[PDB]
């Protein structure tokens, strides 16, 4: 069922609600992803102003279904295995030595279009850290992401650690706790232990006057054997 929802380029729309110590935020998102590449192309839009936190800081809130799984992995795809009705992912995210997010999100299908509706809140952030301060790069890293069932919860719980570049050299890490559960009560793939390889690169779209992120990102699920 699920599969074959993804087997060509399906469009994305990405709306989160944030609230960072206090500075409430919004960001509007657009663009499209093609699974059988591991590809999503996206741009990103503060409609609030300027966003209060740095843009890298947003990218993994900001559609794991858009995953490459290999042929022989398919049955441990669980992100495509619940759509259309979709599933809940929530997070924590630990920034080492400053504050956490916590986010809500709901994906699934709007008609022909994969939504992701999020709910952020931050938390016991430093105004002059890494993330308040705006020390960080624009730029981003490849990560491995841990994937493992959860069959309590009928669903995954992930973790992995971003590792954001600062502007004097060193590293911000950001520390992920994830879980994701269905929304219909159908049948979705529980996966054996594995991981995704991730990569992302940020740019600027020079015309635009707006706080916005472009994002190219290509994901593929390994670990298992071919
Ligand atoms: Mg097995």
């Not at 290999?70 to 929530?90: I, L, N, R, T």
């Not at 992930?158 to 600062?166: G, L, Q």
Request: aromatic share 10%.
């Amino acid at each position: 069922k699920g599969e074959e929802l993804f087997t060509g380029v399906v469009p994305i729309l990405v709306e989160l609600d944030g609230d960072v110590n206090g500075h409430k935020f919004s960001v509007s998102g657009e663009g499209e992803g093609d699974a059988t590449y591991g590809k999503l192309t996206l741009k990103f839009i503060c409609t609030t102003g300027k966003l209060p936190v740095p843009w890298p800081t947003l990218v993994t809130t900001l559609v794991q279904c858009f995953s490459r799984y290999p042929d022989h992995m398919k049955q441990h795809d669980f992100f495509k295995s619940a759509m259309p009705e979709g599933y809940v992912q929530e997070r924590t995210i630990f920034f080492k030595d400053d504050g956490n997010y916590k986010t809500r999100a709901e994906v699934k299908f709007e008609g022909d279009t994969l939504v992701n509706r999020i709910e952020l809140k931050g938390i016991d952030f430093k105004e002059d850290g890494n993330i308040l301060g705006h020390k960080l790069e624009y730029n981003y890293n490849s990560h491995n992401v841990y994937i493992m069932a959860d069959k309590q919860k009928n669903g995954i719980k992930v973790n992995f650690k971003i590792r954001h570049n600062i502007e004097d050299g060193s590293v911000q890490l950001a520390d992920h706790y994830q879980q994701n559960t269905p929304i219909g009560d159908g049948p979705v793939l529980l996966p054996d232990n594995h991981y995704l390889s991730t990569q992302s690169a940020l740019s600027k779209d020079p015309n635009e006057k707006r706080d916005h992120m472009v994002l190219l990102e290509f994901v593929t699920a390994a670990g298992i054997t071919l």
